[PDB]
Design a protein around this ligand. Structure first.
Ligand SMILES: *[C@@H]1O[C@H](CO)[C@@H](O)[C@H](O)[C@H]1NC(C)=O
Lengths: 192, 214, 209
């Protein structure tokens, strides 16, 4: 009978960097997904394998709400079957994804004159992430045959890059807050 | 997608002076993905600046970069002879894109071309084609207009041009333009003329010949 | 640290060609790697990119025709080019991309020529004087290059040998000129020596008024 704590996710003051994406497990509660879809405060609300309207009539064992910040031109990568810096090295959705991807412009909260250096992404990785894999490692990347031993230099690079969000950037370089709802024993979360 | 436009297309300066090369992006973008490259004649491109303002390893101190948003700048503070080359800016959005390049050339005083016109040879005529050639020799600056005229009809679409590289001793250019006609068409007209426009000429210079007159 | 491109050559339109880039001092499979090409007298054009993790991307002008790949055990990057077109004629460079740190390592490049033309030696015609100018028109040859000298190398002052132009026939053509004192037209012999090695054609053409 309790409402699902969606407000803690969508209205959080701080969001995580994509490399260190947050996951909120939703359990034992009731959820109005049409209320979310009816806010219309979203530039992206794409549902895969389900209908936003029919979500209010379904039940699931576990709902996950993943949350992070990326740039506008990278929102397209938050979808099944996609490739790119985010999908390959930061946040990967499965090809059979059953859930919803919601995004909104956050230039008013996440950008700063002089640059916000708090939001980062992984630029350097040897291999692709598996679906729902989180890599928070900060080890020096070896681009050559010589081991780096924690020392930056030729062929030895820090793996993370700041987005440096500035308000004067175009929409593609501007910050976007993203919430991925994943719908998965007994059901615990249901709609009305 | 980001489009990079460099300016000016050609920059003409002397050794020891300061060069300012510009790169304009079609949208406001992050400076961390802006790079500048030098390409000397015959050689591969060479990284000069990355992240808009960071000098690459081993690059001399007189190269520096700056800018933000849509406007980026490469500054070469005290030109050396080896710096006269082509420069490209480059942005990485989701993949690399390059500007169209700025040529840095040696500046000198205006020098007007000497102009020569050559009829087709009798030997070439035997084989059914006539090439008429107009030479513009040792001029500066590079901008020059060749207008072919046949019996005073201006010709369009039947000529090709090529230009030498700046001369290492007098810093001039030379230009050759070839008008190509079939022999049958060549024989229908009398006066073949090359009209040349250039800053060093007060009025255009026309060189001509009459077909069949020695 | 170097990248060495191989495999460039002459191909007919519609044909295929595989370029290779052998690396030392970087590991291809650990890097963002690009192919970047430069058509004659034109600027740099990004062609293709492969991520360390295997994702690939292509310029719209080569999409569906080119495939970038690599062999880790040979530390080598490849570009397979199918359905080649005349506009694909260019020098192809491999480069290691650091994204935020630029393309720091570049190969010297390998030249690809796409054309329907068959090998053909040039016709050499005089550009006869009427400071005097004279020259040789070196017409209708394939492939590049030709070499031109004057009086077997004895005359270099005032010589301009122009870049070849590609004609609409697919054959090349160039002019070589020299300016001389008009008083020497009556006293000096001028001979342009044209060499086209692909056809084993050598021509010595005397040019007179
Ligand atoms: C976020 O806050 C707004 C205004 O305080 C509220 O109306 C909205 O319901 C909240 N979002 C969610 C998903 O609860």
């Amino acid at each position: 009978t309790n409402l699902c704590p969606f407000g803690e996710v969508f209205n959080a003051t701080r969001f995580a960097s994509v490399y260190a994406w947050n996951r909120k497990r939703i359990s034992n509660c009731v959820a109005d997904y049409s209320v979310l879809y009816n806010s219309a405060s979203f530039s992206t609300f794409k549902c895969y394998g389900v209908s936003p309207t029919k979500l209010n009539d379904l039940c699931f064992t576990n709902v996950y709400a993943d949350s992070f910040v990326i740039r506008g031109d990278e929102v397209r990568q938050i979808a099944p079957g996609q490739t790119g810096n985010i999908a390959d090295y930061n946040y990967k959705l499965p090809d059979d994804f059953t859930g919803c991807v919601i995004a909104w412009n956050s230039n008013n909260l996440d950008s700063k004159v002089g640059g916000n250096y708090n939001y980062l992404y992984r630029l350097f990785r040897k291999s692709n992430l598996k679906p729902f894999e989180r890599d928070i490692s900060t080890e020096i990347y070896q681009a050559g045959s010589t081991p780096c031993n924690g020392v930056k230099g030729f062929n030895c690079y820090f793996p993370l890059q700041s987005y440096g969000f500035q308000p004067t950037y175009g929409v593609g370089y501007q910050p976007y807050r993203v919430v991925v709802l994943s719908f998965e024993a007994p059901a615990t979360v249901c709609g009305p | 997608e980001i489009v990079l436009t460099q300016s000016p297309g050609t920059l003409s300066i002397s050794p020891g002076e300061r060069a300012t090369l510009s790169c304009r992006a079609s949208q406001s973008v992050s400076s961390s993905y802006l790079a500048w490259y030098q390409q000397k004649p015959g050689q591969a491109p060479r990284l000069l600046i990355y992240g808009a303002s960071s000098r690459a390893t081993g690059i001399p101190d007189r190269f520096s970069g700056s800018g933000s948003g849509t406007d980026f700048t490469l500054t070469i503070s005290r030109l050396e002879p080896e710096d006269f080359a082509v420069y490209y800016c480059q942005q990485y959005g989701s993949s690399p894109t390059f500007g169209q390049g700025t040529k840095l050339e040696i500046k000198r005083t205006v020098a007007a071309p000497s102009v020569f016109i050559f009829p087709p040879s009798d030997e070439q005529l035997k084989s059914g084609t006539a090439s008429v050639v107009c030479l513009l020799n040792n001029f500066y600056p590079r901008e020059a207009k060749v207008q072919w005229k046949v019996d005073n009809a201006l010709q369009s679409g039947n000529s090709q041009e090529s230009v030498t590289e700046q001369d290492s001793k007098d810093s001039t250019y030379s230009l050759s333009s070839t008008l190509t006609l079939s022999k049958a068409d060549y024989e229908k007209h009398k006066v073949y003329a090359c009209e040349v426009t250039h800053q060093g000429l007060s009025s255009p210079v026309t060189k001509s010949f009459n077909r069949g007159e020695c | 640290v170097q990248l060495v491109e191989s495999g460039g050559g002459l191909v007919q339109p519609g044909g295929s060609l595989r370029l290779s880039c052998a690396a030392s001092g970087i590991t291809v499979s650990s890097n963002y790697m690009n192919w970047v090409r430069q058509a004659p007298g034109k600027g740099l054009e990004w062609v293709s990119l492969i991520y360390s993790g295997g994702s690939t991307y292509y310029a719209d002008s080569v999409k569906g025709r080119f495939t970038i790949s690599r062999d880790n055990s040979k530390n080598t990057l490849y570009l397979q080019m199918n359905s080649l077109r005349a506009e694909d004629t260019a020098v192809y460079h491999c480069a290691r991309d650091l994204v935020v740190y630029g393309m720091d390592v570049w190969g010297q490049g390998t030249t690809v020529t796409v054309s329907s033309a068959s090998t053909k030696g040039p016709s050499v015609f005089p550009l006869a004087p009427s400071t005097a100018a004279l020259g040789c028109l070196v017409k209708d040859y394939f492939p590049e290059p030709v070499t031109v000298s004057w009086n077997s190398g004895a005359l270099t002052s005032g010589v301009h040998t122009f870049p070849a132009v590609l004609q609409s026939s697919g054959l090349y053509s160039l002019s070589s000129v020299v300016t001389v004192p008009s008083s020497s037209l009556g006293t000096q012999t001028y001979i342009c020596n044209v060499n086209h090695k692909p056809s084993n054609t050598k021509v010595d053409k005397k040019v007179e008024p």
